[PDB]
Amino acid sequence: CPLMVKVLDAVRGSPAINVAMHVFRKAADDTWEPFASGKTSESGELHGLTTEEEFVEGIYKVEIDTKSYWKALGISPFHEHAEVVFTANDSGPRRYTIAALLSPYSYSTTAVVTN
Amino acid sequence: CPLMVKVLDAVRGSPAINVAMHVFRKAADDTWEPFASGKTSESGELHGLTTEEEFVEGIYKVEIDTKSYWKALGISPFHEHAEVVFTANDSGPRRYTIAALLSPYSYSTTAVVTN
Amino acid sequence: CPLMVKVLDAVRGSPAINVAMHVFRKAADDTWEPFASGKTSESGELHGLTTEEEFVEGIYKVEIDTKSYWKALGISPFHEHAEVVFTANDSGPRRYTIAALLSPYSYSTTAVVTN
Amino acid sequence: CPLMVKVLDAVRGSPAINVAMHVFRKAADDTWEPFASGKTSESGELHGLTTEEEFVEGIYKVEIDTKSYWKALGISPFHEHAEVVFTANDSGPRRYTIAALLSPYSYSTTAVVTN
């Protein structure tokens, strides 16, 4: 699949399991249209969000529901979610891995783009 | 001055100067209302966005125009913009410092909340 | 293998390939004894550094040769290397993945510890 | 004041206060000679480590005692200490700010070099 997300928990030193995420794609009217969603597995990875055919060029937003993740663990974090907004496939099809590293008051995201 | 934003450049090891950003507050209808904006100084900091009486509890979004920063340096980056979305909370400390560390394909944000 | 290292390049949005690293283990005399070494593959990963039998309890240092990596790409970075120093296996055998994210003037390391 | 160190706590969203650190300078025999030390203030900063005339070009190591910080909070961390190893260079800017962001199983350091 051309879009995968992996999430780590910097407090536990573990993959962040059951992190919900919603992907949106900017529509012609400049609105965010729902594109795909899912939750991380026990490996902290979310595979199978989309297909090469459906993952056309556009501007995508991956909302990672970090507040819902920390609150499900009984922790009150700072951010509502982590957002990753990027243009995809504008030079032809690519594979995107979006990594995220979570702490209650800090996070880091990184993209690995392969052809 | 209850809200400050500081932006650093991880490629050059410098403050990120002249970085534009807009702050929004979430309205009752779930839309983002413009709240404040500015661009970072020679120290990479943006002061004076708001005041204590105006900065009431609620959900805020800081949208940092990282793509324009990198393009002005002749570098093509991954993200359209860096986003920091959070709830302001009176039960906690009263000063919010949002820091963002920028790289072309990665960005980490941290919140430092002090009294 | 119970110790793996993965390295990403935040400038290119790519696995950091051919990053050399040297692992040391603290000896009884408080010196750092050479334990294992290798370089990242095209996936940015270094597998096979050690075995369950040889990876005994102790204090280990993973030196990641980030300067040698950036200089081989014609970039002058800030750090000499990235160091990761940790006690391993003190509660019994574990598997350790050490992740590192590199920029010329900044890096981040993260440990995933599994049983 | 050519060298300052700032330490932040990513779990609590605060300066990391009372964090001890030692700075070493690499000697001609490749050993680490003690150079300066101190502990972070209520702002998470350590000022006054050295002076311009003493801080000559060479390789320096800042060893930050992160393990003691986390244990004082009742948290068991991964790393023995955070290490920042770098060459001071006169050709570049003259002020060095080393920042470290701490989480139990992860830590990111950045250098901000300004004039």
User: Do the chains contact at C59 and D80, CB–CB below 8 Å?
Assistant: yes
Q: Is A13 within 8 Å of chain D by CB?
A: yes
Residue D95 CB: number of other CB atoms within 10 A? 12
Q: Which residues of A12-39 are buried (b: 16+ CB within 10 A; e: fewer)?
A: bbbbbbebbbbbbbbeeeeebeebbeee
Quick one: resolution in A? 1.2
Separation between Cα atoms, residue C52 and residue A12, nearest integer Å: 23
Q: How far is B89 from chain A (nearest CA, A)?
A: 9
C108 annotated as ligand-binding: yes
CB-closest option in D13, D14, D112 to B8: D112
* Contact call for residues C17 and C42 (beta carbons, < 8 A): yes
Write down the experimental method used for this entry: X-ray
The dihedrals phi and psi of B107, each to the nearest 5 degrees, come to -155, 135
D6 annotated as ligand-binding: yes
Q: Is B35 helix (H, G, I), strand (E, B) or coil?
A: strand
D75, closest residue in chain A (CA to CA): A11
The dihedrals phi and psi of C12, each to the nearest 5 degrees, come to -95, -15
* Contact call for residues C23 and C4 (beta carbons, < 8 A): no
* Contact call for residues B104 and B10 (beta carbons, < 8 A): no
* Contact call for residues D61 and D69 (beta carbons, < 8 A): no
| Beta-sheet strands, E only, within chain B | 3-9, 14-15, 20-26, 32-39, 45-46, 58-64, 79-88, 95-103, 106-114
* Contact call for residues B17 and B40 (beta carbons, < 8 A): yes
* Contact call for residues B16 and B109 (beta carbons, < 8 A): no
The dihedrals phi and psi of C49, each to the nearest 5 degrees, come to -60, -35
D chain contacts of residue A101, beta-carbon cutoff 8 Å: 106
Percent helix / strand / coil, chain A, rounded to 5: 5, 55, 40
User: Do the chains contact at A8 and C113, CB–CB below 8 Å?
Assistant: no
In the 3-class helix/strand/coil scheme, how is D37-80 assigned residue by residue? EEECCCCCEECCCCCCCCCCCEEEEEEECHHHHHHHCCCCCCEE
Separation between Cα atoms, residue A93 and residue C79, nearest integer Å: 35
* Kind of pairing between the strands at A95-103 and B95-103: unpaired
The DSSP call for residue C92 is: B
Beta-carbon contacts of residue A55 (< 8 Å; ≥ 6 apart): A2, A3, A88, A89, A93
The dihedrals phi and psi of D70, each to the nearest 5 degrees, come to -65, -40
CA distances, D110 to each of C78, C91, D1 (Å): 9, 32, 18
Separation between Cα atoms, residue C41 and residue C7, nearest integer Å: 10
B chain contacts of residue D14, beta-carbon cutoff 8 Å: 112-114
**Virtual torsion, Cα C47, C49, C51, C52, nearest 10 deg:** -80
Q: Which residues of D21-57 are buried (b: 16+ CB within 10 A; e: fewer)?
A: bbbbbbeeeeebeebbeeebeeebbbeebbeeeebee
